Design a protein around this nucleic acid. Structure first.
Ligand SMILES: [Zn+2]
Length: 638
RNA sequence: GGGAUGCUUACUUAGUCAUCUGGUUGGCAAACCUCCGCGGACCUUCGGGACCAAUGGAGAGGAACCCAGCCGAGAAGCAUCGAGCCGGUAUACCGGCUCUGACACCAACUGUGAUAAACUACCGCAUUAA
RNA sequence: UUAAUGCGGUAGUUUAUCACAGUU
């Protein structure tokens, strides 16, 4: 439903000092950005301080100021579709009129309804937070264009974080009310009122509570507070079994959070007449709001990528999205890009709705498959049973192949060059030996993005981070007051943070060109959690090193954006085995160990069918058959 | 890597990899930072939890942070020798072309809810000395 | 009660995990 699949794939680059301006004035120019950058973030933070009190109450009579909150956050549904200036323009005047920053008081607009006109007046007859009072006077010193940007981004901060969450909580609280009210009469066997008694007096807690204090030995040897409560309840497990599941706790009500430089400083939108771009000489016209006439300050940057698919000349920039990571002011060039039409009558958004709200629970996983499988069939122009080209991404460790399926027939499976060396290979050069459930040992740093290589940078930070933590406690710390701060190390972290993030891009890109020679209609994905990452085994007491994961969840979102761009379609199915299941037969191998030994070499052996293919072929051919009715989810969770 | 090499620098060395964020020295300016709060501000197990915050005050370490410097690395404005391709000239000369690793150049940022794992902090039990 | 640990629980500090939704 939402237009999530827009004209994105924005280009961003790092800010570079011009070779011939200065070495200190360049820092003075960044500090010129900094003094304003901190100001706007402080300005928007104070705006939402005075607006959060306009929220709906949901259990109290509707205040006359509630309907202004609805309009100011969601004007598009409350306004006629023929708005003259802008939907954000209407919220600006309403916000201005509600506050004291309206010098003309122009709330008498034809597009403003009666429910909105009186609400704005009722809002002004309320005291402010004494923080916006000095802010509102300060906001009067900006150009209306600045207040145009400032007000609209201030609302968007409140829109999704609070209002949608608060309204979702209303549905959640109604759902919890309906659940708890029915549960009072539907579970009267041992909890008509005793469920409240247990409240007066959590895997470990559940085991101890559902016991007669006999489990306290397990809690102590292998959580004794819950065992004592269970023992006191008897003076037991019969009532604890239902009291815990009652979900007596109040639903998490929306606690508003405020804009900050540390965690989320919004990319300031340098819209029309506020940005410039030059890539023949990579210098950007970065202008602050302080200049009234639009004095674009010239700062060098990294030129346009040579092998980036949409060239600079085919597209026009719309606004610079600049932020502040560390100290370097990175910018973002938002533009448009032409997508490609898909060979279906449906869209990915329809499939998203099915997984999100129609089939959210893990127990409702199988019903999703048949619902999703038949959803595509009528939308297929030709015959999906004979023409639906399919590749199944597996995302292996050393090798990865996508099985090519059209009409349930397997043609061939070929791998990707997803490994980082000075020259790209197909696998890491490891041929030492093979073993079993006896032992394992290997100590050699593979040069690239390997599991051993990513852990190498982690060890170096241990020397630095421990010294930082130790010395910080000596200069002023002189021991439970604090542990450490996020700013101790950023340089090596972002190098490693982008390192894995670029590794995901390597998988993201390689599959895209892998699926372009064959017009693959549908691609399926898995959902794996992980068992044990061997990267960290000795490091401890840090906040800078566990960024060397594989980012399985992020990879699904690169391909989602690229698929609609190239007219491709991707889908994610719940966690089946997909690796302990044979491609041909539905044997459901339960050894779980001899597969892993074969997985090291990239091949496998089947217990039931005897196929001697590769695991990549095995995983991909299964996932392809999961789309068909031949293979389904094991549904062996209970 | 397929050429090697040098001159020039308010350049980069904070896309990754290529044994590799190369190592190292200072910091007056300045930034960073540590304690604070004119104040709010949501929820609350009413104990507290989390965040914003003055065109705001300080103070300090150069452990970090950030500013700056040194060596080297790599990018280029240009130059030297050599080869490939090619023609006019004659068996040779002249001239142009590419001459320099791979990858990716952010679907990105962000919040909330869970999983296993990690140390700090504190308590207690089982096992070790008085 | 002082010293060498292990295992639980709790919070300080995480990260990814899975899921959803915004600026774009
Ligand atoms: Zn089988």
């Amino acid at each position: 439903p939402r237009p999530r699949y827009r004209e994105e794939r924005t280009l961003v680059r790092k800010l570079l000092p011009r070779p011939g301006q200065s070495k200190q004035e360049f820092r003075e120019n960044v500090k010129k950005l900094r003094k304003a950058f901190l100001q706007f973030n402080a300005d928007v933070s104070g705006v939402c301080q005075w607006a959060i009190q306009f929220r709906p109450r949901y259990g109290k009579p509707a205040e006359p100021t509630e309907t202004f909150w609805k309009f100011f956050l969601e004007p598009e549904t409350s306004l006629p579709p023929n708005d003259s200036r802008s939907p954000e323009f209407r919220r600006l005047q309403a916000f201005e009129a509600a506050a004291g920053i309206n010098g003309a008081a122009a709330l008498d607009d034809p597009a403003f309804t009666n429910e909105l006109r009186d609400s704005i007046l009722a809002v002004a007859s309320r005291p402010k937070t004494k923080e916006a009072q000095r802010l509102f006077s300060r906001l009067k010193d900006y150009q209306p264009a600045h207040r145009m940007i400032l007000a609209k981004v201030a609302a968007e901060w409140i829109e999704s974080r609070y209002r949608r969450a608060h309204q979702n909580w209303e549905r959640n609280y109604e759902e919890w009310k309906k659940e708890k009210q029915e549960w009072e009469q539907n579970h009267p066997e041992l909890t008509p009122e005793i469920r409240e008694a247990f409240n007066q007096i959590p895997a470990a807690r559940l085991l101890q509570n559902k016991d007669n204090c006999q489990y306290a030995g397990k809690n102590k040897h292998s959580h004794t507070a819950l065992c004592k409560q269970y023992q006191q309840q008897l003076s037991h497990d019969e009532l604890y079994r239902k009291w815990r599941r009652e979900y007596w706790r109040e639903p998490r009500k929306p606690v508003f959070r405020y804009p900050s430089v540390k965690r989320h400083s919004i990319a300031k939108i340098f819209g029309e007449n506020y940005f410039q771009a030059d890539f023949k000489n990579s210098v950007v016209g970065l202008r602050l709001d302080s200049m009234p006439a639009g004095q674009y300050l010239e700062f060098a940057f990294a030129p346009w990528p040579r092998n980036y698919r949409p060239q600079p000349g085919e597209t026009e920039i719309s606004s610079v999205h600049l932020h502040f990571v560390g100290t370097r002011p990175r910018i973002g060039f938002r533009f448009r890009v032409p997508h490609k039409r898909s060979r279906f009558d449906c869209t990915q958004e329809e499939l998203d709705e099915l997984r999100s709200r129609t089939f959210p629970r893990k127990a409702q996983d199988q019903k999703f498959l048949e619902a999703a499988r038949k959803r595509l069939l009528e939308t297929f122009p030709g015959n999906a049973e004979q023409e639906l080209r399919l590749l199944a991404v597996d995302l292996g460790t050393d090798s990865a192949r996508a099985a090519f399926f059209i009409g349930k027939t397997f043609q061939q499976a070929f791998p990707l060059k997803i490994v980082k060396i000075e020259k790209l290979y197909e696998q890491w050069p490891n041929q030492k030996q093979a073993g079993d459930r006896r032992d394992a040992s290997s100590k050699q740093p593979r040069p690239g993005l390997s599991r051993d290589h990513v852990g190498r940078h982690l060890q170096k930070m241990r020397a630095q981070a421990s010294e930082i933590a130790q010395k910080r406690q000596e200069l002023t710390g002189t021991a439970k007051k604090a542990t450490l701060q996020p700013f101790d190390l950023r340089g090596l972290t972002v190098h490693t943070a982008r390192m894995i993030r670029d590794w995901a891009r390597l998988n993201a890109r390689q599959i895209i060109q892998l699926a372009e020679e064959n017009q693959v209609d549908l691609i399926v994905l898995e959902s794996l959690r992980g068992f044990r990452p061997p990267g960290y085994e000795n490091l401890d007491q840090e906040k800078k090193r566990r960024v060397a994961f594989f980012a399985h969840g992020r990879i699904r979102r690169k391909v989602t954006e690229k698929a609609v761009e190239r007219g491709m379609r991707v889908v994610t199915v719940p966690y089946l085995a997909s690796s302990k299941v044979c491609a041909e037969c539905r044997k459901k191998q339960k050894d779980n160990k001899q597969w892993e030994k074969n997985k090291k070499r990239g091949l496998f052996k089947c217990e039931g069918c005897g196929s001697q293919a590769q695991v990549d072929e095995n995983a991909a051919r299964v996932l392809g058959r999961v789309f068909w009715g031949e293979i389904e989810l094991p549904t062996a969770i209970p």
